[PDB]
């Protein structure tokens, strides 16, 4: 561990005081947004949160409980949401208007992700067992993938809009090339329970979380299992997963945030939240040691890895 990591703890540097389902930085890591069961997307200024004694600069009320947020990687002011009615909405946080309301899903949509490299493209996954690919210039879905089980998470590859990872209630990660959706490129088995999150560390490194109380690392160039991470408790809830080039962080049903270095299977450190409660959302500030966290009480903390 000493070769790979210089950290032993997480420091709390700010706190905002139900469930927060999603917490995400905008394109420049300047603003962040929260959303969840209270039917409200709240936008905060990160530097104000860190420097001050805590009010959002924008709030947008919604028709349904929110499951996920994804900021646009090109249009600074645009953010997508998925909700419990199945609706995938693109919002403008300056005008507060919904720019697009995509309504084809028949059940709760659990996840939405805006592509980094083709930024008008966004993908969603739903309890209706469909993955839908959307373009912000078109009202109808561009691609539909009919799957056999509830979709819990979808994520675009960071280097190409042709590939998506799909975490399924069937316990597998389905990795698709959107140029030919008749079969996935590869289906990664290993998790013993539903796959609740998928996130990329890099073009070829995919991480997942599952209610089998593990995170797993996968090689999507050569289609190989790499590593399994253990320590946290996650047997039933969406507890959050965030990764960067070197680190994975996830929530726990013990109301603790866990951090792993990608080369080491047991945690570098953990943090007991001030709160019966579970961590519900986490987000790294890009490749820095700073991260946003939130729990089922609605408390938000800014944490930083420290020696």
């Amino acid at each position: 561990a000493m070769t790979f990591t210089r950290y032993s703890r997480l420091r709390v540097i700010a706190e905002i005081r139900n469930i927060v389902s999603s917490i995400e930085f905008d394109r420049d890591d300047e603003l962040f947004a929260t959303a969840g069961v209270s039917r409200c997307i709240k936008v905060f200024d990160f530097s104000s949160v860190v420097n001050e004694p805590q009010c959002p600069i924008v709030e947008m009320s919604t028709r349904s409980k929110l499951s996920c947020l994804s900021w646009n990687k090109h249009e600074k002011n645009h953010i997508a949401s998925s909700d419990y009615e199945g609706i995938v909405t693109v919002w403008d946080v300056t005008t507060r208007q919904s720019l697009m309301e995509y309504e084809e899903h028949e059940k709760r949509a659990w996840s939405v992700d805006f592509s980094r490299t083709e930024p008008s493209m966004l993908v969603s996954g739903s309890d209706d067992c469909k993955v839908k690919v959307w373009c912000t210039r078109q009202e109808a879905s561009v691609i539909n993938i009919d799957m056999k089980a509830n979709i819990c998470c979808v994520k675009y590859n960071p280097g190409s809009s042709n590939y998506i990872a799909v975490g399924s209630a069937d316990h597998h990660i389905h990795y698709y090339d959107l140029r030919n959706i008749s079969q996935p490129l590869h289906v990664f088995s290993g998790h013993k329970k539903a796959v609740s999150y998928v996130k990329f560390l890099s073009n070829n490194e995919l991480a997942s979380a599952s209610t089998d109380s593990t995170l797993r690392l996968w090689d999507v160039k050569d289609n190989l299992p790499v590593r399994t991470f253990r320590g946290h408790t996650n047997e039933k809830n969406f507890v959050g997963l965030t990764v960067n080039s070197e680190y994975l962080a996830c929530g726990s049903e013990t109301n603790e945030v866990y951090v792993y270095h990608k080369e080491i299977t047991r945690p570098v450190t953990s943090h007991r939240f001030g709160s019966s409660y579970f961590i519900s959302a986490v987000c790294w500030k890009s490749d820095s040691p700073t991260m946003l966290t939130a729990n089922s009480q609605g408390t938000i903390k800014v944490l930083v890895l420290a020696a």
Binding site: N150, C152, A169, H171, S196, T211, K236, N237
Partner: peptide
């Protein structure tokens, strides 16, 4: 309640 679905 934020419960993950599971086909099994």
């Amino acid at each position: 309640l934020l419960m993950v679905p599971d086909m099994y």
